[PDB]
């Protein structure tokens with residue numbers, strides 16, 4: 705029944721594509737193949753209602769900055785994604801993604817999505833960020849970023865384990881219905 709265009713943006717290698725592949729097909733590959741542009745689809749049921757969810761997977765890489773806004777018109781909801789184990793990808797939520805999205809789409813709801821949850825509390829990945837004086841992004845920190853960018857929701861997920869995965873898209877839909 706209801707068509708909903710959801711566009712997915714965020715830094716190169718945060719897990720945009722994996723998130724969408726894991727959700728639509730239940731697969732996960734460890735291999736990194738940088739997106740140019742891809743389209744996904746899902747027929748979902750949310751709070752009683754049938755939804756045709758269109759999923760626009762954009763290129764995270766800087767080289768695509770002039771092309772990426774071509775995808776923006778008519779968007780119903782954005783997911784702005786960052787990796788929970790990349791503080792730099794997190795800063796870019798506010799330094800790059802929020803301003804870019806808002807530049808072309810002043811009113812479209814934003815869901816902030818922290819990705820790679822399976823690594824956030826991983827004892828080992830913590831010590832390995834600690835060398836570079838880095839710390840994974842915690843839940844309240846993510847919450848505070850969502851408020852800072854006026855996001856409708858803050859959600860955390862893992863494409864690998866699928867923890868928090870369905871909610872991301874339920875809530876993307878709920879922000880539109």
Ligand SMILES: Nc1nc2c(ncn2[C@@H]2O[C@H](COP(=O)(O)OP(=O)(O)NP(=O)(O)O)[C@@H](O)[C@H]2O)c(=O)[nH]1
Nearest residue numbers: 716717718719720721722734739764820862863864
């Ligand atoms: N441990 C873990 N790795 C993940 C997860 N999601 C993605 N990755 C890994 O992170 C890398 C980048 O994934 P990808 O989905 O391609 O990122 P992207 O945001 O789509 N990149 P691009 O903007 O360049 O298209 C891959 O090696 C992938 O296997 C996750 O939930 N957990």
Ligand SMILES: [Mg+2]
Nearest residue numbers: 720721738739
């Ligand atoms: Mg990709």
